[PDB]
């Protein structure tokens, strides 16, 4: 039982990753990865000549190179702050020394030492004079230590994690330490898309990975480039990524619909889940192929839904697979919620009995979904799609969905097939946020600011916004209440312009001495700006929901920066009376206007 990973020192992989990072031309990166893969395959073939069977060929390599898709081991439980604290404790660095502050406050560019955005480069700079020049760690040993720390985190043991990290630090150099930090953070910055990696690895690796959602099965099956796979489709008890509806134009729907009849359904803003039942064994998977069977139970004896759904299935059904949405239901008011009971609403079916229906058109799938079980309100539901062939039907559906305080609507073609890992192929979504002139836009002020990371390292990334309070007549407000945090909706040029304009007006904020003018809740800003010097920011939010992280008690869902209003003076900030008026206008979703054309 010999493993190739044990014969490949981690130094080679780290050097290959560094070469990929430094390289600019995509062709150079592809060539480097291809040569590394060819060398690995040649070594594996040579080593296992005596052995007539192999248990693993390239799984560790892909697992390390693609930490985002890693699924064999649970989450490490460590991130930027925790990793920095562990590094400081392990290296015995001074608690208040420059290195410790730089590591903890890696985002802050005050130190202006190299890159101030990425934690990995700061870690590399601090560790450069501490670690050796050449390491002595093999990929197999690195994987062993990584799964050890994962298990210890799952085992609720901290001393073992500390020991593993100490061993990793001792048996590695600065470059490998930086790389390993990046992979633990699950951010490699290789600059190469996943599709390119899968294609270069094998011709049909992407489809197999999407169907199975496992870096082990893809590596085990697709090893020799010459040999391919003919039959690929959804497999029993296998996680497969679901579809995602792209933005739907509200002017050429028929063109996207081919002028044929289309199915309209209400939008379900819940947890996307997939179910696989085989006799007694139930398996539940999340959107990203994350196991959730523990909470919901793998058997009818225990769980949250299995005891209620086992008896509701037809006697002639033994093996089946479905996919739907998970929400909470309230029997007191007989309504769903975005005491409470778990409720599953299914809208598609993949496999039933021993036949595959992935290639079947949506009509047959919907017929099966209507003839798959007996739905019961509150626990199991079937989406009641409605046929339509005119713009009037879809616009009326959107209007009534808006009236019913619904997130939106979904449109599908009856002839569409189920192709996993597709964005807006046959399914499209229409929600009021996607149509202009339908949001009760807001104009607020920015009072704080948090230093950015990564690409937006040496600049201002996101700001904490606050709303003014009703002041005495003829007097501009001076007391502000934090509302939410806005980071998106801006590009590099205009964001850099805003940073430049207020660069000299920024003032550090102290937790123990909060500024009198600005009042903050649980969340605090790294750097604060007085209200008199600020810019009016336009924000369009899907909805406003109650919260406790801000003084005002309400937060905006999916907030954005729509623009900056220079003409609007800072004193024109809206008051809390406006907040309560907007909240009471609809008690939730901002959209309340009927769209008519």
């Amino acid at each position: 039982s010999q493993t190739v990973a044990s014969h490949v020192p981690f130094a080679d992989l780290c050097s290959t990753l560094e070469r990929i990072q430094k390289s600019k031309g995509r062709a150079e990166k592809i060539r480097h990865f291809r040569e590394f893969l060819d060398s690995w395959r040649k070594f594996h073939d040579a080593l296992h000549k005596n052995h007539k069977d192999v248990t693993d060929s390239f799984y560790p390599a892909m697992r390390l190179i693609l930490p985002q898709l890693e699924r064999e081991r649970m989450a490490y439980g460590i991130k930027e702050t925790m990793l920095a604290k562990l590094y400081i404790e392990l290296l015995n660095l001074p608690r208040d020394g420059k290195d410790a502050l730089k590591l903890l406050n890696y985002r802050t560019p005050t130190g202006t030492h190299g890159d101030a955005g990425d934690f990995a480069m700061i870690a590399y700079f601090v560790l450069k004079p501490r670690c050796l020049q050449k390491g002595s760690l093999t990929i197999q040993q690195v994987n062993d230590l990584l799964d050890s720390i994962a298990s210890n985190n799952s085992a609720k043991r901290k001393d073992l994690i500390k020991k593993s990290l100490l061993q990793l630090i001792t048996q590695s150099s600065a470059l490998e330490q930086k790389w390993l930090i990046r992979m633990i953070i699950k951010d490699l910055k290789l600059g190469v898309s996943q599709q390119t990696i899968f294609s270069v690895f094998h011709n049909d690796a992407a489809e197999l990975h999407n169907v199975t959602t496992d870096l082990e099965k893809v590596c085990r099956q697709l090893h020799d480039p010459s040999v391919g796979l003919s039959d690929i489709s959804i497999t029993l008890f296998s996680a497969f990524k679901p579809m995602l509806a792209a933005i739907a134009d509200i002017e050429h729907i028929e063109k996207d619909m081919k002028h044929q009849s289309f199915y309209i359904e209400t939008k379900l803003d819940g947890e996307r889940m997939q179910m696989h039942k085989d006799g007694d064994v139930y398996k539940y998977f999340s959107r990203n192929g994350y196991n959730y069977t523990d909470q919901f139970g793998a058997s009818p004896t225990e769980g949250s839904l299995t005891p209620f759904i086992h008896n509701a299935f037809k006697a002639d059904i033994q093996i089946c697979i479905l996919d739907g949405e998970m929400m909470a239901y309230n029997p007191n008011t007989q309504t769903f919620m975005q005491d409470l009971q778990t409720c599953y609403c299914v809208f598609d079916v993949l496999m039933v009995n021993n036949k595959k229906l992935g290639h079947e058109t949506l009509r047959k799938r919907y017929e099966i979904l209507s003839s798959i079980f007996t739905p019961i309100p509150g626990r199991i539901e079937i989406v009641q799609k409605t046929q339509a062939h005119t713009k009037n039907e879809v616009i009326d559906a959107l209007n009534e969905a808006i009236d019913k305080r619904e997130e939106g609507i979904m449109v599908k073609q009856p002839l569409s097939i189920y192709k996993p890992d597709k964005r807006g192929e046959g399914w499209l979504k229409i929600k009021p946020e996607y149509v202009s002139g339908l949001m009760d836009e807001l104009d607020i002020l920015i009072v704080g600011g948090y230093w950015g990371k990564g690409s937006r390292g040496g600049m201002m990334s996101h700001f904490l916004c606050a709303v003014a309070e009703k002041p005495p007549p003829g007097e501009k407000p001076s007391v502000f209440h934090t509302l939410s945090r806005v980071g998106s909706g801006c590009t590099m040029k205009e964001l850099y312009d805003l940073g430049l304009k207020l660069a000299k007006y920024w003032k550090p904020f102290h937790r123990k001495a909060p500024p009198s003018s600005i009042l903050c809740g649980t969340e605090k800003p790294e750097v604060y700006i007085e209200p008199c010097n600020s810019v009016i920011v336009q924000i369009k939010a899907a909805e406003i929901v109650p919260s406790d992280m801000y003084k005002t008690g309400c937060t905006l869902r999916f907030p954005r920066i729509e623009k900056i209003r220079d003409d609007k003076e800072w004193h024109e900030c809206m008051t809390l009376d406006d907040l309560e008026q907007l909240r009471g206008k609809a008690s939730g979703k901002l959209a309340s206007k009927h769209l008519y054309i």
């Binding site: 014969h7 020192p9 060398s39 040649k42 070594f43 040579a46």
Partner: peptide, 26 residues
């Protein structure tokens, strides 16, 4: 031979910017 022998190691348009001093010496 182990992990030793299996591992080794006109377009666009021209532009120009004129910079002119504005000091009295000029």
């Amino acid at each position: 031979s182990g992990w030793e022998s299996y591992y080794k190691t006109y377009s666009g348009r021209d532009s120009l910017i004129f910079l002119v001093d504005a000091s009295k010496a000029m």
